[PDB]
Amino acid sequence: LDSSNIPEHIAIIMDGNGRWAKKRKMPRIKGHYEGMQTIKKITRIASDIGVKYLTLYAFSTENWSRPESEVNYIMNLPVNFLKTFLPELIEKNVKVETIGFTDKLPKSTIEAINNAKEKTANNTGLKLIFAINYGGRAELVHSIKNMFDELHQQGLNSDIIDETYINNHLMTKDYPDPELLIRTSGEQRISNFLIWQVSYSEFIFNQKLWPDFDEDELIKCIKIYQSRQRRFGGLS
Numbered sequence: 001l002d003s004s005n006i007p008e009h010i011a012i013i014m015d016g017n018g019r020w021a022k023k024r025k026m027p028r029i030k031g032h033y034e035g036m037q038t039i040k041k042i043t044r045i046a047s048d049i050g051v052k053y054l055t056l057y058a059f060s061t062e063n064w065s066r067p068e069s070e071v072n073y074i075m076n077l078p079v080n081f082l083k084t085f086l087p088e089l090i091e092k093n094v095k096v097e098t099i100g101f102t103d104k105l106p107k108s109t110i111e112a113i114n115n116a117k118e119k120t121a122n123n124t125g126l127k128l129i130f131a132i133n134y135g136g137r138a139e140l141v142h143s144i145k146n147m148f149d150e151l152h153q154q155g156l157n158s159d160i161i162d163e164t165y166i167n168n169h170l171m172t173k174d175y176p177d178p179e180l181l182i183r184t185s186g187e188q189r190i191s192n193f194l195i196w197q198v199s200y201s202e203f204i205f206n207q208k209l210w211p212d213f214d215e216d217e218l219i220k221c222i223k224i225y226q227s228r229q230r231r232f233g234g235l236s
């Protein structure tokens with residue numbers, strides 16, 4: 001890797017857990033259990049190489065359409081993940097955050113995530129950001145409602161709204177936009193993930209199923225990224 005060109009923010013759509021379990025004739029939930037474990041491997045190598053922000057698409061606002069047993073299983077995984085992995089996150093100076101409407105989660109999931117946010121609040125290393133009950137359209141609808149009330153309550157009209165103002169009112173207001181979006185499994189679509197924020201992101205559509213995505217594969221993705229020529233509408 002070119003150590004002077006490590007992306008500051010990588011966003012990942014963790015797809016393929018269902019297919020990984022079906023290949024093995026195991027229930028879909030087994031693939032999610034293995035996919036929650038794979039998050040630990042990726043957090044480790046992202047922190048070690050000096051990625052500043054890692055946003056993981058854990059559950060979207062459309063994923064409520066899935067069978068309730070699968071929804072409840074995914075919603076409970078964070079409790080398991082933080083129970084075993086929080087000590088290492090503290091030690092590795094990782095700061096845990098979320099984006100999404102995290103109020104709709106099971107109480108025990110809220111408590112486990114809040115405890116992890118509080119225990120890592122002053123950490124200055126990798127920001128590990130879980131997008132849980134998150135969708136880019138719903139994020140915009142919510143930010144729009146906030147902006148409409150803030151402007152009226154400040155005695156402002158809408159002439160002050162520009163792209164920068166919207167950036168500062170999204171759930172990602174404290175993060176830069178990701179340079180790189182990786183999606184596993186093969187699919188080639190963004191499925192409502194960070195739709196405003198990925199306007200100029202590089203995409204990589206990696207063919208491994210999420211539970212098979214490992215350190216080596218993350219490094220190969222960053223190497224691919226470093227070969228991309230980004231133009232932002234201009235000439236190279």
Ligand SMILES: CC(C)=CCC/C(C)=C/CC/C(C)=C/CSP(=O)(O)OP(=O)(O)O
Binds near residue numbers: 015031058210
């Ligand atoms: C955030 C946290 C600490 C733990 C939660 C971690 C996990 C595993 C969340 C499930 C992630 C999802 C919805 C993956 C889509 S794989 P898919 O079901 O779409 O697979 P398929 O397309 O059917 O192969």
Ligand SMILES: [Mg+2]
Binds near residue numbers: 015016
């Ligand atoms: Mg899928």
